[PDB]
């Protein structure tokens, strides 16, 4: 019994909110014994007794005890949470709402265990997060409230972000591109990222830029036939969702966002093609409504015209979603929690490297307008470098597109560069 | 229409958490017009547009706007709460949990109206509380 104090403490708190008047009192006494036997420190005082009339609306009392113990009794954390989750499933709907209330204060304490000298206790926290991920998938009705409490607050702990995100990708991987498990984790990242926009953005982008960089090892005729295709597709849905309201930090990552847009335009199933179109429409909107950058009133007029142009039927054809009335509808699916996506009509339009120039120069027009205001900006020099690396490296799925872009944006060329281009033609 | 800023503001926020991708975007635009037309002060900036892909998990965004407006836009309080309660009943279970999230900041602002020089506005607050009392009786699960 001494070995399992955390396991009992959850039985005391779960049964204090019960609906049987003779089960609250029995639970109050068990809680009283625990503090004396284990020297747990609480705010008030407790005195064992029989005959107490404990009220039914015993909710803020439980939350006050749980908040205190979590604050100054951390070592119980791991064994407390493991039990609380297991008790979540078995309880009824009304008791499920209680378990959320007093569970949240503990979630802060995972700070120390995430780096506990790799003592195999780190393996334990990841199991807990994998358990939390399963509640979100199933408890559809309480979805608006789990996001505000569990993920909204758990995502404000900088030291814990890296591990949490990793589990998100692994869970999505098994489901697949259209799977429910992968679909939901895309949404959840929005709440996680609200705490630290500057850190989740520079970590979902940093994985995409590397997956693309690894297709060189085993070149394939096209991306969709590559082994790592599925990894790329899911990581794109993350980028779509984070783009709204400037949760992809554009004021620092604009180079690395265009660089991937140009490698994705008009590739994939019709759902993935309406996603790329939407992603661009949101990166431009974020520019117009950002305070970090100070664009003069002249520049902002340039952007707004760009915002309108991209929504004309001309650009629906360039992105390859002509015959689609609105992109938003196709990009999102209403019944994304109940059933997995059902792709069909494998017949897939072609792409013409002349189309890529028209888009690639529309973007370049936007970027230069910004660089006029932003002093000593480095956007264009970073984007060029990314293109110049894939342009002169053998990869039959990325090389052609990295040449049509290297030339459309580059500002200087030397004899040494021309010889390579003319010897790729030979 | 200039006399009902609080009644519209609840329609914009209620539907921003909807499940139809083409009803969030339309609701985003309505919110943009309200701030300019009525000079409401918010944290960020909003720009009317068409074609936006607004994500479904749009929850901490709504709560952030509501929290700001309640803090430094109190006069809307009474007409805001009266509508929010009336919108609670008609919505579904999942949307009911949302209405709680962004309703709470406003509740704390009733302070001023409770002693509003007995201008018959005090009779209004008691109606709101009587409405709140009815939700508690019926919504057993929550």
Compute the distance between CA of residue B103 and CA of residue B97 in angstroms, rounded to an integer.
10
Q: A210: distance to nearest CA of chain B, Å?
A: 26
Cβ neighbors of A263 (< 8 A, separation 6 or more) are: A212, A398, A401, A402
Residue B101 in tokens? 């999230």
Compute the distance between CA of residue A355 and CA of residue B42 in angstroms, rounded to an integer.
41
Q: B97: distance to nearest CA of chain A, Å?
A: 6
Residue A106 in tokens? 């503990």
* Chain-chain contact of A145 with B56 (C-beta, under 8 angstroms): no
Q: DSSP code of B76?
A: G
Cβ neighbors of A276 (< 8 A, separation 6 or more) are: A236, A261, A264, A265, A266, A319
* Chain-chain contact of A145 with B97 (C-beta, under 8 angstroms): yes
Residue A111 in tokens? 């700070």
* Chain-chain contact of A144 with B55 (C-beta, under 8 angstroms): no
Residue A64 CA, distance from chain mean position: 32
Alpha-carbon torsion A157, A245, A315, A326, what sign? positive
Residue A17 in tokens? 């909110």
- Within 8 A of B56 by CB-CB distance, chain A residues are 187, 332, 336
Compute the distance between CA of residue A419 and CA of residue A402 in angstroms, rounded to an integer.
17
A65, with CB counted inside 10 A (0-12, 13-18, 19+), is buried
Q: DSSP code of A269?
A: S
Angstrom CA distances, B40 to A373, B69, B80, B107, B142, stand at 29, 8, 14, 19, 33
Compute the distance between CA of residue A341 and CA of residue A183 in angstroms, rounded to an integer.
9
* Chain-chain contact of B141 with A93 (C-beta, under 8 angstroms): yes
Q: How many CB atoms lie within 10 A of CB A395?
A: 17
Chain B CA closest to residue A283 = B52
Q: Which residue has the tokens 């008791």?
A: A95
Residue B45 CA, distance from chain mean position: 19
Q: Smallest Cβ distance to A289: which of B19, B46, B56?
A: B46
Q: Are B85 and B136 in contact (CB under 8 A)?
A: no
DSSP string, A349-384: ----HHHHHHHHHHHHHHHHHHHHHSTT--HHHHHH
Compute the distance between CA of residue B81 and CA of residue B85 in angstroms, rounded to an integer.
6
* Chain-chain contact of A144 with B59 (C-beta, under 8 angstroms): yes
Q: Which residue has the tokens 């747990």?
A: A40
DSSP string, A222-251: SGGGSTTHHHHHHHHHHHHHHHGGG-S-HH
Compute the distance between CA of residue A295 and CA of residue A291 in angstroms, rounded to an integer.
9
Consecutive H or E run containing A78: helix A77-90
Q: Which residue has the tokens 């992968």?
A: A182
> Which of A332, A334, A335, A336 should be substituted to probe chain B, the one whose Cβ sees the most B Cβ atoms within 10 Å?
A332
Q: How many CB atoms lie within 10 A of CB A227?
A: 11
Q: Coil, helix or strand for A290?
A: coil
Q: Are B53 and A332 in contact (CB under 8 A)?
A: yes
A182, with CB counted inside 10 A (0-12, 13-18, 19+), is buried
């Amino acid at each position: 019994p001494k070995d399992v104090p955390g396991t009992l403490l959850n039985i005391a708190l779960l049964n204090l909110g019960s609906s049987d008047p003779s089960l609250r009192s029995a639970a109050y006494n068990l809680l009283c014994a625990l503090t004396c036997t284990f020297n747990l420190k609480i705010e008030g005082q407790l005195l064992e007794t029989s005959g107490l009339c404990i009220p039914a609306n015993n909710t803020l009392f439980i939350v006050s005890i749980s908040k205190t113990l979590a604050a100054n009794e951390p070592h119980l954390t791991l064994e407390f949470l493991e039990e609380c989750i297991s008790g979540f499933s078995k309880s009824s709907i009304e008791l499920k709402h209680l378990c959320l209330e007093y569970m949240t204060p503990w979630l802060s304490n995972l700070v120390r265990f995430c780096k506990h000298n790799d003592d195999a206790k780190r393996q334990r926290v990841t199991a807990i997060l994998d358990k939390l991920i399963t509640m979100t998938i199933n408890e559809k009705q309480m979805y608006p409230s789990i996001q505000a409490k569990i993920w909204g607050s758990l995502g404000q702990i900088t030291d814990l972000l890296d591990v949490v995100l990793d589990s998100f990708i692994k869970t999505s991987a098994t489901g697949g591109l259209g799977s429910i498990k992968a679909e939901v984790m895309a949404d959840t990242a929005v709440a996680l990222a609200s705490g630290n926009v500057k850190l989740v953005s520079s970590k979902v982008i940093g994985r995409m830029c590397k997956i693309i960089d690894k297709t060189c090892l085993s070149p394939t005729p096209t991306l969709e036939q590559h082994l790592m295709w599925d990894d790329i597709a899911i990581l794109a849905r993350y980028m779509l969702m984070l783009s709204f309201n400037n949760s992809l930090d554009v004021a620092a990552h604009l180079p690395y966002l265009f660089h991937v847009v140009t490698f994705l335009v008009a590739t994939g199933p019709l759902s993935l093609r309406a996603s790329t179109h939407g992603l661009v429409i949101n990166i431009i909107h974020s520019l117009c409504t950002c305070s970090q950058l100070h664009f003069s009133e002249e520049t902002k007029q340039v952007l707004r015209l760009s915002l309108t142009e991209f929504s004309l039927p001309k650009f629906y054809l360039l992105f390859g979603i002509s015959k689609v009335k609105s992109a938003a509808v196709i990009a999102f699916r209403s019944s994304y929690r109940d059933r997995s996506f059902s792709p069909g009509s494998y017949e897939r339009e072609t792409f013409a490297l002349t189309s890529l120039e028209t888009v690639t120069e529309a973007l370049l027009e936007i970027m230069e307008a910004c660089m006029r205001d932003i002093p000593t900006c480095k956007w264009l020099d970073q984007w060029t470098e990314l293109a110049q690396r894939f342009a002169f490296q053998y990869n039959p799925s990325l090389q052609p597109r990295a040449l049509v872009v290297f030339g459309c944006i580059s500002k200087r060329v030397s004899h040494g560069q021309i010889k390579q281009i003319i010897r790729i033609l030979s």
